[PDB]
């Protein structure tokens, strides 16, 4: 191991990080996902389209928690998502060790953004090919953050990454309310997911996590299909 | 507890004549109250014009002797010439100070000839202070040998005595007699003696029996 000390990401003559644009293109080409906020919580939804049923779709998970009060989903490359979620878990654990208090979601997203920036400006590495939708609850408040492969971040009330992501964003804008409940958030998220699923969603193909004052928890297929039945 | 140092005994003496150098040492290796061997000369000839007498802790003696050999070889290859007596003295002093915090428990005498065909004897210490003197004795019996050398070779504290420069025969007889005397009162020396004569004819080694006790 030597390690290249020249940053693979470089400023184009126009200043645009065309490499980061290609990373975002890979994100768009990856599986879609959506995130939405309610007046008292956050809901993250995404689809897991495997090949034919020979894959045990139950065995693998896409929605992942970082703490009891923080979860996230990704759009892009699973290999990058695994290492990124592992590092975010380490950062949250280190913060909890240092300050004996749960990680604020904003601070965790800031740390993830710093990690992504270090990757993008460092040498010998590849920018991450994922976009993270992060749900968190702290101080009796919900938080939903968009984090891009460029390393920036935003607090978004609703978002949709992946294929047809602009249309998903417009659909969420049309079907989004300021003071909706968690039930309305779940209805809207599943509605967007079925509007952009392309292939007759199932309870196995939809995996959803909810973050509120009670913490973050992933809905099992039972109540998953229950909500799909209630939403039609 | 472990003691990194032990005094193995041995006595080194040297006299710098006007055209020759003499460096003599017993071949008694000691340890506590037991004598190991009757043959281990403390004199080691580096070149045809320089010999070293090293006494004290035998492990440091051997390692320092080999270090001097290695540095002699490196300097010889570098400069395409042999080392002078003064150069060897300065190099050995630097080597000694290189172990300032782990001192070499060895006494060193550099006996040789300079470019002017003159004897030169350099005394040292465990740390590396050196100087050139006409005659010096070190080791176990340095205290038993220095006054006699001062009175005879240096003609010190004498009245109505002219100063004849010492010859080879006088130096040899004197060193034999002084070790004859030393082997009696000192227990660390005796049973044998190796003498190195450094002259323009070369290095002559002479072995003489001492008090076998």
């Amino acid at each position: 191991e030597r390690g290249y000390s020249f940053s693979l990401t470089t400023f184009s003559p126009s200043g645009k990080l065309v490499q980061i644009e290609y990373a975002l293109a890979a994100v768009a080409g990856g599986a879609p996902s959506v995130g939405i906020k309610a007046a008292n919580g956050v809901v993250l939804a995404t689809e897991k389209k495997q090949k034919s049923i020979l894959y045990d779709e139950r065995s693998v998970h896409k929605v992942e928690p970082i703490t009891k009060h923080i979860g996230l989903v990704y759009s892009g490359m699973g290999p990058d998502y695994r290492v990124l979620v592992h590092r975010a878990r380490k950062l949250a654990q280190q913060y909890y060790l240092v300050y004996q208090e749960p990680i604020p979601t904003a601070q965790l997203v800031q740390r993830v953004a710093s990690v992504m920036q270090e990757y993008t400006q460092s040498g010998g590495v590849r920018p991450f090919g994922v976009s993270l939708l992060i749900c968190g609850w702290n101080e009796g408040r919900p938080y939903l953050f968009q984090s891009d492969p460029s390393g920036a971040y935003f607090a978004w009330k609703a978002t949709a990454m992946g294929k047809n992501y602009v249309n998903g964003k417009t659909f969420l804008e049309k079907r989004y309310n300021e003071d909706l409940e968690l039930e309305d958030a779940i209805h809207t998220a599943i509605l967007t997911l079925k509007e952009s699923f392309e292939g007759q969603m199932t309870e196995d193909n939809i995996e959803v996590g909810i973050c509120n004052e009670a913490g973050f928890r992933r809905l099992t297929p039972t109540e998953v299909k229950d909500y799909l039945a209630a939403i039609a | 507890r472990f003691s990194p140092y032990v005094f193995n005994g041995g006595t080194i003496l040297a006299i710098a004549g006007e055209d020759f150098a003499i460096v003599a040492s017993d071949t008694r290796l000691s340890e506590g109250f037991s004598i190991h061997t009757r043959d281990s000369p403390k004199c080691y000839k580096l070149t045809d014009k320089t010999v070293i007498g090293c006494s004290g802790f035998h492990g440091d003696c051997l390692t320092l002797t080999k270090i001097i050999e290695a540095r002699l070889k490196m300097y010889k290859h570098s400069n395409n010439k042999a080392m002078t007596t003064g150069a060897i003295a300065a190099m050995l002093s630097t080597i000694l100070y290189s172990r300032r915090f782990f001192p070499y428990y060895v006494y060193n005498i550099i006996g040789g000839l300079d470019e002017e065909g003159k004897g030169a004897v350099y005394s040292f210490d465990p740390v590396g202070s050196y100087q050139r003197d006409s005659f010096k004795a070190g080791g176990s019996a340095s205290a038993m040998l220095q006054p006699l050398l001062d009175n005879q070779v240096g003609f010190k504290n004498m009245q109505n005595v002219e100063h004849v420069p010492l010859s080879l025969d006088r130096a040899m007889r004197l060193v034999k007699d002084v070790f004859i005397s030393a082997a009696e009162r000192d227990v660390y020396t005796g049973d044998a003696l190796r003498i190195c004569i450094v002259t323009k004819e070369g290095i002559r080694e002479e072995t003489v029996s001492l008090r076998k006790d």
């Binding site: - | 002093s93 005394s123 210490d125 590396g128 202070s129 100087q131 003197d133 010096k136 205290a143």
Partner: protein, 201 residues
Amino acid sequence: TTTLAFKFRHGVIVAADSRATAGAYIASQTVKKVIEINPYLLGTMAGGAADCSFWERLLARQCRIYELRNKERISVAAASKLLANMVYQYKGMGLSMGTMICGWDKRGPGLYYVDSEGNRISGATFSVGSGSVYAYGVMDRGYSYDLEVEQAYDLARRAIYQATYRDAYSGGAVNLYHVREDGWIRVSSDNVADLHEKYSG
């Protein structure tokens, strides 16, 4: 072990005994206790003879480098500071060295003192060694900034003689050095016995 040094109108005088003892035993009576750092710079050895010699030689090497690099003779103050830093970086490591360095520079005569403890002190008169406590008496009671060269010589010789006589760790012969504008001159090297007979008669 006894070294003294003092500046005055016509330069600086350094004197030293030539006895070095290994404990209660006189190791040698011909030790050149005055080290010639340069043809214009002088040091001494007091305490650890080997440590003093090594550090003086390293200072000589460093000042030769400085002179070659900057095309100027090294200032006595600069040399004192360099040696003080060099010894101080190894303080509390068993080093037992102490020496005064004197010379002539752009600011006339200049004498500084350094030790294994890192104490760098300027001054007009100094003396370090076993008998330096004695040499203080004679040097201070006979010292004058306007002494002639011969008066400085015999004052230093008398002070060393008294130190060697009263003390037991000092003896052999006195080595005398006069440092003036051009450099140093070996004034004399006189046996203490001859000094005693001359002073008695």
